[PDB]
């Protein structure tokens, strides 16, 4: 599934949610693999480089969509700033044209993902212990501390429940401002855009709510599980299954944190557009 994001005015990007999770899962496998032994630590330079070459390659496949994406930006530019029928239909076709462009470059995206799976599985396959019945967990401990711990704290320092309460509040206010607002001639083009922006904002809200639930669920699971795989040893097979389980937990957690932030920014970019149209209704036309 695809998520379209408008973080700043004039900027528009998309994410293939399964691809982001897949690419990230293999990043964790690669790192857990090299951190297990002190002799393989120095391979961080080579792993950082390969992952960077894959992200830049994936970005080069989306950068070859930039024409149709900029065409959608211009349609959004007209919609967001009227100061709606054909404009509403214009928006949906340009949106379906972009979605069609992403499906056409599927083979190009899939291969990079497949190239990352091959690299990740290969590093992981090469994971060896001095004594297979007593595998160290220093790698799991180092990886968590250096790639994951700061993200759990970042989430805990923020208040995402308040963020959803503050988002519903803005949605409640626009619903009230639309209803408890005296009707006026020529305001129709603006009333339709507000009702439209509000719907897109309610859709963005539902996504943020869906992702915050995953962040909250995964933050407890990660913190609980990490305690059980940290200051001990495992038989090789158990160590590997334990690394696989953590990578899946990390990948899902990271993905939706990344998406919540991006959708938070898009809810507020579209909120700036509601403030502007309501300002035009009250000041340029005074609709008490």
């Amino acid at each position, epitope marked *: 599934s695809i998520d379209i994001l408008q973080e700043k005015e004039g900027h528009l990007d998309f994410v293939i949610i399964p691809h982001y999770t897949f690419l990230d899962y293999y990043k964790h496998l690669s790192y857990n693999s090299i951190y297990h032994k002190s002799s393989t630590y120095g391979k961080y330079i*080579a*792993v950082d480089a390969f992952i960077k070459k*894959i992200n830049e*390659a994936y970005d080069k496949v989306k950068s070859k969509c930039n024409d149709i994406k900029n065409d959608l930006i211009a349609t959004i530019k007209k919609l967001e700033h009227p100061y709606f029928k054909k404009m509403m239909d214009e928006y949906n076709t340009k949106k379906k044209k972009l979605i069609k462009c992403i499906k056409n470059h599927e083979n190009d995206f899939n291969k990079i993902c497949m190239d990352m799976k*091959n*690299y990740g599985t*290969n590093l992981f396959e*090469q994971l*060896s212990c001095y004594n297979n019945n007593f595998c160290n967990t220093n790698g799991i401990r180092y990886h968590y501390d250096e790639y994951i711990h700061k993200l759990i704290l970042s989430v805990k320092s923020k208040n995402l429940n308040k963020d959803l309460s503050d988002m519903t509040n803005i949605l409640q206010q626009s619903e009230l401002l639309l209803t408890n607002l005296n009707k006026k001639m020529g305001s129709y083009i603006y009333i339709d855009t507000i009702k439209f922006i509000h719907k897109e904002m309610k859709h963005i809200f539902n996504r943020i709510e869906y992702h915050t639930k995953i962040i909250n669920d995964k933050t407890k699971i990660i913190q609980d599980k990490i305690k059980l795989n940290i200051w001990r040893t495992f038989q090789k097979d158990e160590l590997l299954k334990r690394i696989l389980d953590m990578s899946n937990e990390y990948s899902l957690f990271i993905t939706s944190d990344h998406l919540r932030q991006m959708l938070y920014n898009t809810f507020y970019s579209k909120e700036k557009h509601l403030n502007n149209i309501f300002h035009h209704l009250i000041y340029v036309l005074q609709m008490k």
Partner: antibody, heavy 121, light 112 residues
Framework: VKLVESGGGVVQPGGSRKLSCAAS????????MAWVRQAPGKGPEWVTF????????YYADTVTGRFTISRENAKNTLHLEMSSLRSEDTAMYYC???????????????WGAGTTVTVSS | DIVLTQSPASLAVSLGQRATISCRAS??????????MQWFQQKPGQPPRLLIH???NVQSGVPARFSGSGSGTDFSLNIHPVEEDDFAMYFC?????????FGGGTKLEIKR
């Protein structure tokens, strides 16, 4: 670091053969392994590859469905089960150790002396 | 399938001279800024011996007189200066796409 192939000899057409390869001087389970063959008067031809823990297995289209690579990590042994042998399979069969370079590629660094398989009636 | 075409098929050289042998691939053997071209040496009745792996990476134990260059589809092996033990067969090989392919070979022979 040594690789020793065994199991060669004469096979009649349509016949089968198993080839073994004993590895010494390194941790066998830490490497990908392969069979490469060389027909008399011809260059090397890659036939099959098995990764460290057998997650990845590849075959040449010329061998696909007829040959089976396998490994016994604890016994330092690479195996090659050959099945519907034609005259075209007559070759020196080499066993090779594969290194996974951190730039994301496999290369063969250590090869054994080989074992001859002669497919003739 | 990737077809590696080696040129020349045979090359005669004298002791102390440079020997440059080339390989051309049917399509790019590049994989994320790395050209996956290997070079092997082979003497009669002996298995192939690895010389270069990353198009340019000299294997440990292989002397400094051997060097590799090129990218994409055009690759070359340089031996300078040529020594007595250098007269052998040389093959190139790609590991970018399976089946992993070798070239036909170039025989480096002594001039007399």
């Amino acid at each position: 670091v040594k690789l020793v192939e065994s199991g060669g000899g004469v096979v009649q057409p349509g016949g089968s053969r198993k080839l073994s390869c004993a590895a010494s001087g390194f941790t066998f389970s830490d490497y990908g392994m392969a069979w490469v063959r060389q027909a008399p008067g011809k260059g090397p031809e890659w036939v099959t590859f098995i990764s460290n823990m057998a997650y990845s297995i590849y075959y040449a289209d010329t061998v696909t469905g007829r040959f089976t690579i396998s490994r016994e990590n604890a016994k330092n042994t690479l195996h090659l089960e050959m099945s519907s042998l034609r005259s075209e399979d007559t070759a020196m069969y080499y066993c090779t150790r594969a290194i996974f370079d951190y730039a994301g590629y496999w290369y063969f660094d250590v090869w054994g002396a080989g074992t001859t398989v002669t497919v003739s009636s | 399938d990737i077809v590696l075409t080696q040129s020349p098929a045979s090359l005669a050289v004298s002791l102390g001279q440079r020997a440059t042998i080339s390989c051309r691939a049917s399509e790019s053997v590049e994989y994320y800024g790395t050209s996956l071209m290997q070079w092997f040496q082979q003497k009669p009745g002996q298995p192939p011996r690895l010389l270069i792996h990353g198009a340019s990476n000299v294997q440990s134990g292989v002397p400094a007189r051997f060097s590799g260059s090129g990218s994409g589809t055009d690759f070359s092996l340089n031996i300078h200066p040529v020594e007595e033990d250098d007269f052998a067969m040389y093959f190139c090989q790609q590991s970018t796409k399976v089946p992993w392919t070798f070239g036909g070979g170039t025989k480096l022979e002594i001039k007399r």
